[PDB]
Amino acid sequence: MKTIGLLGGMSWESTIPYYRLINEGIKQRLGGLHSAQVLLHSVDFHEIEECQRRGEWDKTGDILAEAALGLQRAGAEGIVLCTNTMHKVADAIESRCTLPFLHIADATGRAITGAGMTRVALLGTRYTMEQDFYRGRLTEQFSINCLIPEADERAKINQIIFEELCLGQFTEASRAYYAQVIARLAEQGAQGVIFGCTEIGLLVPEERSVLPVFDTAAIHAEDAVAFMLSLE
Amino acid sequence: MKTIGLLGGMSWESTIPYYRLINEGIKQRLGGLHSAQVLLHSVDFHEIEECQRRGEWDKTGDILAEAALGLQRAGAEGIVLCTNTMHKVADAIESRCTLPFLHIADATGRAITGAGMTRVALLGTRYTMEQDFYRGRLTEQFSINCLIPEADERAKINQIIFEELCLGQFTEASRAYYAQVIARLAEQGAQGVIFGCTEIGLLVPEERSVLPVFDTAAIHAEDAVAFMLSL
Ligand SMILES: N[C@@H](CC(=O)O)C(=O)O
Ligand SMILES: N[C@@H](CC(=O)O)C(=O)O
């Protein structure tokens, strides 16, 4: 199998499902006590998230490109970035590191494509929902259109991610609020919902979503597994 | 903070508690969204575990020393090996890698020392329970003596580790069996119980142990946090 290189810590809470599912994927395919060959660089999320709010995206591109290059030298054979928001600077990583870069939005777009859907709801950080870097790739490469919540809903969705989810707090109040937003986008004709923040899956089980769930972290991890074994 | 280097995936299920507890310790200490600087090398445990059964210990020493050296060169400032059994080959890592090596038995010995205890039960793989490499360090460095289960109990304890715990299977029958062994070693005057396999705490909650619990993984993670920020 190939050694996968993970850029994690963003937050570390959502790096864990990546680690778990990549190992469970290898066990499923290889059987026995086999586990995945993983190199993980977990960053201090404080610096990353600070740059997000300052708009210092070039600085985060440096941080992540350096991290990927260090994993390359350690033997990583592909790069997985464990965060939807930071694919805003995926170009920097793909440009400065020659390793194959498994873009989260490609794995998500193939999953939605496989379910035959072109109009889906999108939850994530305010950056991922409101800007073009994520939604524009889904549109240009898969002809997939995203519906996002209203402004007041986006601010609270974003607040929960950073003030609760990334600190390990999963409240039923926030869980029920996310379910409520999903249900409103369902009435706009959304066919599925992207959990487009890697932590949302930690808060919202699939039976709380009135609509079929695309969990970016699960989907990304399965794409990692398929790369490590040269499958799918 | 110093970036920590983890040698994990032995098994990956016990690597997760390390990653969680190290991050939580950094958060508690720096506050806010601060997270731990971590480089993890997770190996394929199949090759390691087969080597244990074949007695190919030198081969695992090479694997782990090479892994440690790769992490050092990626920026690792200290090494944490996320497994009790493989400290049998800690000498290979410490001899070939100049980084500070945070020995799991030293972290556990200071915890038992802090509790004022000198006679404890030891649960773990058959290798950790029966051989000298782990218990001999506790004896030499801390004057701590370990009591271990009888032979039939050791075989089933080890059995559960590799056929259930390392596969993510946590059964009540196994949990109850471990609980009965702990209650049995308590009869021999064990003052506490070392969970000397990093997966045992995933199975046995502290409230199922009639003895005070030294969870090796938790203690090791707390020591790593203390190192990373020089406490
Ligand atoms: N990890 C979350 C939050 C973040 O990275 O800002 C995401 O996928 O967007
Ligand atoms: N992780 C277990 C099993 C092993 O690595 O052999 C231990 O601490 O000993």
The DSSP line for chain A is -PPEEEEE-TTHHHHHHHHHHHHHHHHHHH-TT----EEEEE--HHHHHHHHHHT-HHHHHHHHHHHHHHHHHHT--EEEE--SGGGGGHHHHHHH--S-B--HHHHHHHHHHHTT-SEEEEES-HHHHHSSTTHHHHHHHH--EEE---HHHHHHHHHHHHHTGGGT---HHHHHHHHHHHHHHHTTT-S-EEE-STTHHHH--GGG-SS-EEEHHHHHHHHHHHHHTT--
Same domain, B159 and B62: no
Phi/psi for A192 (5° steps) reads: -160, 165
Query: Residue B147 gets which letter from DSSP?
Result: E
Q: Contact at 8 Å (CB) between B125 and B105?
A: no
Determination technique for this PDB entry? X-ray
Q: Which of B19, B33, B41 sits opposite A166 (nearest CB)?
A: B33
> Quick check: A177 and A154 in contact, CB under 8 A?
no
- The C-alpha atoms of residue B165 and residue B14 are separated, in whole angstroms, by 9
For B154, what's the count of Cα atoms within 13 Å in the CB-facing half-sphere? 16
Q: Position A64: which residue type? A: L
A132, with CB counted inside 10 A (0-12, 13-18, 19+), is: exposed
The number of C-alpha atoms within 13 Å of B93 and in the hemisphere containing its C-beta is: 26
Give B213's Cβ-side CA count (13 Å radius). Answer: 22
Helix (H, G, I), strand (E, B) or coil at B49: helix
Q: Are residues B109 and B99 in the same domain?
A: no
Judge if B136 and B158 occupy the same domain. yes
What does the block give as tokens for B29? 């200490």
Smallest-distance ligand from the CA of A165: 1
* A137 backbone dihedrals φ, ψ, rounded to 5°: -70, -40
A123 and A203 assigned to the same domain: yes
Gap between the Cα atoms of B112 and B118, Å rounded? 7
Residue B196 host element (H or E) = none
Tokens representing B69?
Answer: 């050296």
Q: Is A79 in the pocket of ligand 1 (CB under 6 A)?
A: no
Two tokens, residue B151: 């032979």
| Residue whose C-alpha is closest to residue A19's, from B208, A44, A123, A27 | A27
Name the nearest CA neighbour of A89 among A104, A111, A74: A104
Pairing of strands A38-42, B38-42: antiparallel
* Torsion sign over Cα A51, B35, B12, B224: positive
In Å, how far from its chain's centre is CA B81?
Answer: 8
What DSSP character marks residue B168? T
Strand order of the β-sheet with B4-8 is A78-81, A4-8, A38-42, B38-42, B4-8, B79-81
Spell out the alpha helix ranges (H) of chain B. 12-30, 45-54, 57-74, 90-96, 104-114, 126-130, 135-142, 151-163, 172-187, 200-203, 216-228
CA dist., res. A121 & res. A189, Å (int): 9
b/e A78-116 (16+ beta carbons within 10 angstroms → b): bbbbbbbbbbbbbebbbeebebebbbbbbbbbebbeeee
Q: Compute the CA torsion angle A75, A80, A86, A88 (nearest 10 deg).
A: 100
Judging by DSSP bridges, how do beta strands A213-215 and A193-195 pair with one another?
parallel
Minimal CA–CA distance to B190: which of B133, B112, B126, B124?
B112
Q: How many Å apart are CA A205 and CA B112, to the nearest integer? A: 40
Asked whether residue A129 falls in the same domain as residue A203, the answer is yes
What range does the domain containing A44 cover?
Answer: 1-103+216-232
Are the Cβ atoms of B45 and A33 closer than 8 angstroms? yes
Cis peptide preceding B11, ω within 30 of 0 = yes
Task: Tell me if A60 CB under 6 Å of ligand 1.
Answer: no
Burial class (CB in 10 A: 0-12, 13-18, 19+), B116: exposed
Gap positions in chain A, given as the residue before each gap (C–N > 2.5 A)? Answer: none
CB A217 within 8 A of CB A20: no
Domain match, A89 and A21 both: yes
Annotation says A197 is catalytic = yes
**Cβ B27–A167 below 8 Å, yes or no?**
yes
User: Nearest CA to B45 among B28, B21, B69, B67?
Assistant: B67
CATH number of domain containing B145: 3.40.50.1860
Query: Residue B194 carries which DSSP code?
Result: E
CA angle at A223 for the pair A124 and B165, rounded to the nearest 5°:
95
> Do residues B83 and B91 make contact, with C-beta atoms less than 8 angstroms apart?
no
Phi-psi region of B75 (alpha: psi -120 to 50; beta: other; left: phi over 0): left
- Identify which of A16, A122, A123, A125 to mutate to test ligand 1's pocket (most ligand atoms within 8 A of the CB): A125
The finding on whether A125 has its CB within 6 A of some atom of ligand 1 is yes
- Structural domain tally of chain A? 2
Q: List all residues 6 or more positions away from B147 whose beta carbon is below 8 Å from its beta carbon.
A: B119, B120, B121, B122, B185, B188, B189, B190
C-alpha–C-alpha distance, residues B138 and B159, integer Å: 25
Q: What distances in angstroms separate CA B114 from CA A122, B73, B107, B117, B219, one per listed residue? A: 51, 35, 11, 8, 12
Q: Are residues B110 and B14 part of one domain?
A: no
The burial of A31, by beta-carbon neighbours within 10 Å (0-12 exposed, 13-18 middle, 19 or more buried), is given as: exposed
Strand partners, B101: B79
Looking at the fold, whether A22 and A1 belong to one and the same domain comes out as: yes
Of A35, A42, A44, the CB nearest to B45: A35
| Same-domain pairing of A151 and A223 | no
Q: Judge if B82 and B115 occupy the same domain.
A: no
For B104, the 3-state DSSP assignment is: helix
The pair of three-digit structure tokens given for residue A49, joined into one six-digit string: 């998230």
In terms of domains, do A173 and A220 share one? no
* B153-192 exposure pattern, b = at least 16 Cβ within 10 A, e = fewer: bbeebbebbbebbbeeeeeeebeebbbebbebbbeeebbb
C-alpha–C-alpha distance, residues A184 and B178, integer Å: 49
Do A183 and A95 share a domain, yes or no?
no
